[PDB]
Amino acid sequence: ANRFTSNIKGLTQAARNANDGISVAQTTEGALSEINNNLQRIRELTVQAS
Amino acid sequence: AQVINTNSLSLITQNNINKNQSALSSSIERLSSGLRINSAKDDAAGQAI
């Protein structure tokens, strides 16, 4: 029972820590959306100025 | 009843409910915008093309 309790607490803590990764990746994709849109805009007036 | 120290019966439902908010939030956020990707979460090839 002691081993199972320790294992369950560890699994719960790891499961809680896991969502940190998806939060970080969501922040990163939100940040790089700016790079995507700005690069597309640069391509836009690059086509314009060609 | 016999077991009370861990009420498994109450705890079973929470798993399904937690799996449910994922689909609920996904559907509502795809509705709020006119787009279906709305993120990098979904199939990234479709949004790349």
Side-chain angles (χ1 to χ4, degrees):
Chain A
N2 192 327
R3 285 216 300 265
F4 273 10
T5 51
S6 298
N7 200 5
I8 290 156
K9 303 193 62 34
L11 262 67
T12 302
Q13 185 40 45
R16 191 201 217 172
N17 274 32
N19 287 318
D20 306 359
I22 60 171
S23 54
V24 165
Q26 187 182 333
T27 300
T28 303
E29 71 206 59
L32 63 84
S33 181
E34 290 216 339
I35 310 305
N36 204 147
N37 273 17
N38 285 295
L39 272 161
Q40 191 60 76
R41 182 49 170 189
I42 297 169
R43 175 103 199 280
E44 181 56 350
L45 73 165
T46 300
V47 176
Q48 194 281 299
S50 307
Chain B
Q2 61 274 339
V3 293
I4 297 169
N5 304 328
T6 290
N7 189 359
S8 56
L9 198 67
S10 45
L11 189 151
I12 301 299
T13 56
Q14 329 188 26
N15 292 318
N16 306 77
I17 311 154
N18 292 126
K19 292 143 201 52
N20 290 138
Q21 293 83 18
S22 193
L24 172 43
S25 297
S26 173
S27 66
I28 190 167
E29 72 93 19
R30 312 186 43 191
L31 177 63
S32 46
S33 88
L35 277 296
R36 63 102 172 177
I37 314 293
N38 311 303
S39 73
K41 182 93 191 73
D42 201 48
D43 299 356
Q47 63 85 29
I49 316 164

